[PDB]
Symmetry: D2
Subunit: 312 residues, 4 copies
């Protein structure tokens, strides 16, 4: 098993670390910046020696070293700094994602690709358009983070472990997010039974939904850097589901093909991951739940189209 990290920044390094702990494969740490992946590869080799992990680790600036990778994780791109519009970020990261898409097609066209670069809803669609890879072999990590935050906040309020708190959240981050209380459960027991027993109020659930929408910006405001540990953990879970053919269930950006009144777009949705890739499944929404999702989908459609134009 060969795991290629396209981008050896904070998230890529931590995904490497978690792939080693968890013994998923040999690592290729790739970056455009001379020396960064070489340095991080040295650090992760020494880490491996202390913790009893025996996988090969290569840090490289040569894109051909991703040859025949089973797994591609794309964190390649920049952060938006002072003087940069959202449109300038989309142009720079979209050009980078186009170039990565071309390299994956050239060197490792049978890879399972996990897109992570921001803005995520857009950059997964950019990867698909320019990769010529099968839609089942592409996904974007997002929904697991939103689900993990929502479930951990519900668990805190009910004074229970988060281990058996499960929820479906459709769409993207922030305003794009569509959480389903009907598909939220605590070790099989619907959330509504806890409301009925006054262990949590509908106002507390609304407050938790707002904290969930805002969590990425809250971490950026406090740490002056975007989340890195939890994104890495979410990516590592998706890798493991593909490699071990697990059919684990996730909300991730996945290709809709008729599902939820949508085809020919990657969007945050209910999916399972196995060794054939990431496969959507449709559940019955109410009319109001589907109207909210269709609005999330229309925004992704609109922003993706704008991004293709910003890329010439």
């Amino acid at each position: 098993t060969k795991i290629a990290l396209i981008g050896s920044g904070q998230i890529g390094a931590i995904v490497g670390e978690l792939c080693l702990l968890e013994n998923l494969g040999d690592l290729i740490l790739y970056d455009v910046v001379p020396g960064i992946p070489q340095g991080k590869a040295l650090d992760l080799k020494h880490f491996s020696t202390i913790l009893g992990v025996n996988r090969n680790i290569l840090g490289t600036n040569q894109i051909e070293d991703i040859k025949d990778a089973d797994i591609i994780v794309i964190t390649a791109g920049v952060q938006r700094k002072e003087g940069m519009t959202r449109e300038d970020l989309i142009g720079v990261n979209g050009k980078i994602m186009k170039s990565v898409a071309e390299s994956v097609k050239l060197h490792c066209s049978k890879a399972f690709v996990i897109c992570v670069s921001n803005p995520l809803d857009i950059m997964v669609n950019v990867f698909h358009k320019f990769s010529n890879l099968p839609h089942e072999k592409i996904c974007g990590m997002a929904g697991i983070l939103d689900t993990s935050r929502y479930c951990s906040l519900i668990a805190d309020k009910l004074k229970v472990s988060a281990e058996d708190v499960n929820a479906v959240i459709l769409g993207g981050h922030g305003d794009l997010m569509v959480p389903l209380q009907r598909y939220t459960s605590v070790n099989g027991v619907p959330l509504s039974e806890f409301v009925k027993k006054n262990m949590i109020s509908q106002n507390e659930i609304q407050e938790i939904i707002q904290k969930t929408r805002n969590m990425g910006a809250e971490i950026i405001k406090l740490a002056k850097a975007s989340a890195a540990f939890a994104p890495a953990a979410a990516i590592t879970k998706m890798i493991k589901s593909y490699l071990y053919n697990e059919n684990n269930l996730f909300t991730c950006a996945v290709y809709l093909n008729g599902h939820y009144n949508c085809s020919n777009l990657f969007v945050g949705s209910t999916a399972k991951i196995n060794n054939k890739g990431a496969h959507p499944v449709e559940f019955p929404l109410t009319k109001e739940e589907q109207d909210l999702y269709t609005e999330s989908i229309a925004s992704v459609q609109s922003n993706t189209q704008k991004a293709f134009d910003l890329i010439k």
Copy 2:
């Protein structure tokens, strides 16, 4: 941390093994049979060395070596063979559980006690009666094992991982068991949505409930021995929830007083486990759900009474 295994048979040894792998504590392996716990302790020490685990393991025939244990697992008992119900065993297992209860009261009255001997819900009530340990410090492992079977079978049929299939199963083993489809979910999605999508039929769910009830007897019939690995894993999860104060959610035999119309009896029910013990919670049941539960509770009540008389 000191984890005392009262019974060094198949389940006790595998609980020891899983506690060493998870690094939960030092072990005391106790058994009435001279040499058995000493030999298994040697084996688990060599296993520890190969796997890089550092915990102490003592095998002993002296029950006072459980002194100041944090955790007690009781498997002291006989098992059922093919042709036998769980419920037949009450006479000899009752006397054994009474004697263990007396020793735990003497030597480690502040331990969290997980009872595993069959018949499970009866032997938990026997342990409470003769130990006088606090009600919340005593439980029985059953519901996690039943739940694991039911969730495995549902996951197989839906072609999904079992990791996010969750269910509430109330009551004891076999006919005593009350699984709740309404409190079964697949990553938050109620089971009933899968029925609606024709991914599983109500007949397939009934057949899975029957396989769940009969699983213990089926394993005994095939393997010529009762289940050991899954019971051990279920016990280890409950241990970890108590030791790390996790408030993990389980169906286990727990003391109900008022919950689900039940007075003053240990029976399989919804609970959480933290470092103060096992705490029951009551959920809103349907009339038919509560009638089935009440029927299971009445059978445990009746058999517990029979057991106290036999003892």
Copy 3:
């Protein structure tokens, strides 16, 4: 990845369990006895669900289910009874291992094969002779058990963790065993420096070597069963080294090909395991160390010849 357990007794089931915990592959539990592997497969599926493991487990009485296995673990064999001579055991387990060797050649000729049946030094040679598999793709598990016991006992006496106590022990179990104090170290520091500092005496080391030779029989005498947990851990380490191409270092039965004045025999020796198999290496022994090893090798040669004749 497909891991085939040929033998679903105590050691095979625990190897299955540890392969699931380490997520090394899908399991095939094979046995000749109807129902045993089916029952244990049910138990290990339930165990998997409780611990969040997602691998396939098949219990089967049909040898063709081992088709294209990556890994074969052979525990197929009987236990020695009082009437049963060493010669009778060799005859029964020898015939079984010949049949397994033929089935592996037919169904999974690309497997890495770990032989575990008694007597270990003979039965690995029997597998090689009748399999027509490459010698690199075969090994026998023994030396790791002796090393774990010797290192645990040295660690106990020095009051240190066993994690960084390492030793080379050549040959087989009991009288076949050739431990090298010169290749024993505590986090890089030779054993002899501890003798020099009077933290351990040469008499204490000899006593530890005798306890190591006798450990198997001691566990049998206490537990009324042979070691199972530690053998399973040793086997799972060897599996992991092959599957993850680790080049981890072991004393295991490995084919010597000029090493230590020996070719054309499997014997316990210094080897590394990677995804191409099990490869010996030779280290410089003193004349006395090599004479002891050559005597162990002559005994394995002699017993293997006897076994081929009995078979």
Copy 4:
């Protein structure tokens, strides 16, 4: 169990992460900079939920939150960049370590303290002087990191796993470092037997020793940041040895009192760690081995005295 991280930078956060994965205890992430530990605590809580870990994590700017901590890890400092020696800072890191020493004495005087700040052997001596903690309750992580690099490189050359390559390295980082070939083994077999069999040459070993000395600076030069993963792993191993009373064997900065001719000083040496702390042991060195060690010790002695002056 309460684990207090004094410093919520790259090493402290990854120590937190590894303590959560290993389930060692509840975490307190402390830092002087408002918001950084709060943001990283949120990230590590979400990480915990995704990986099925249940421990409490508090990020705080209030030093009194370290109260009754069982374990203290000190990374509070500034780091060296390329063009800087370890020993350069050292007035600012010394004042920081003095202030931490005072806080630990006030709030958690029964803690086991692992010092990590950057002139490592000096800052351990500073912590002892101003904390007055018992000598065996104070140590510094260094030797495990140097050992991991040396063992990794020997394992690479012999084409073996690093799992069973073990070595004693005495003294500090860089020129302070004294590796012992005589106390290097591969699964029990002395390194000298590999030289004898021409599997590795004395020149290859010298080159490996030089790469080991320079590795910190090499990673800084390539990754534009100091090593973080392997230091964190080395710290977590020491924490685990104390918490589980393991008597694991390490080189760490430890109080010598006659050992290896060293009087009343913390220096990199052979020690075991159990729940009573870090306990030094002396092995027989040759005259050349002891002369090199005494030279390393004299430099630490000299620089510690200089550091106390820079602190006035």
